[PDB]
Write a protein that binds this ligand. Sequence first.
Ligand SMILES: CN(C)[C@H]1CC[C@H](Nc2ncnc3[nH]cc([C@H]4CC[C@H](C(N)=O)CC4)c23)CC1
Length: 279
Amino acid sequence: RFHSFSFYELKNVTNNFDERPISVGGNKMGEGGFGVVYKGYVNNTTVAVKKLALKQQFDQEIKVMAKCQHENLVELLGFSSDGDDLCLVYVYMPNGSLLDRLSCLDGTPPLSWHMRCKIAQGAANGINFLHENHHIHRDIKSANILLDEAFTAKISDFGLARAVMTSRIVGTTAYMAPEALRGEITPKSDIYSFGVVLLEIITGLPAVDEHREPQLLLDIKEEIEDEEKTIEDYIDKKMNDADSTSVEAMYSVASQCLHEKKNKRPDIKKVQQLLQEMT
Ligand SMILES: CN(C)[C@H]1CC[C@H](Nc2ncnc3[nH]cc([C@H]4CC[C@H](C(N)=O)CC4)c23)CC1
């Protein structure tokens, strides 16, 4: 099981929940709609503390994380429920998110094609574990693929995860399958979202850019298919080791995951096999 941390302990290790960025000497790593993420130091070890700011997503995170322990999923160390605020304690990921590394946020070097292939394989191994254990993530995106000291991919944020139709449509629209947008709950929707992640890895482009044509990255599949553009035209130029053949083998996997008809998309086990054959 997990550790029950006291609020006071979490308060002094996050320097009284210092909201100043790390870049100016504070403890704030990033904020989202459901809280603030702080850098902490417990057992000399660095930790990530999400102080929540909702209670259902707290319990859903603990529920899914108690059941799901894999090499390619972030690990939750514990939580704090007793004290003024709810916190979630995780293992620290020194290389942040795949989104940030692909955008080279804060001046970090571009990821090589070799690093990118491993991350794709890793993230897929994580999705396969989730699907084998009958869980649908519902928010597969690069911001939710974290990177450790060896740049091993770790799927994060199981707040919207589910063990089919719903009224409460959730996820990130730039990554969502057409049927997910209509209200269907299916593991096939996670496959589609992973296809967008593969496109981000090949291109280094964000899934949505309001000041770009096309605004949505998934739309380049149409441009390539209708021979208006090539996959080579889109390949991230911030790489020196991107081999044409393996880039084409990854784009084929991405194109397959982005099939508009959910039943024509491969299952996650087929995705792993395809990404393995690529290397
Ligand atoms: C924009 N950018 C600066 C981001 C800012 C947040 C960072 N988060 C992390 N950083 C390093 N170690 C980590 N371990 C675990 C996590 C996250 C914490 C938040 C959790 C949640 N349920 O929302 C998911 C797991 C984490 C990632 C980078």
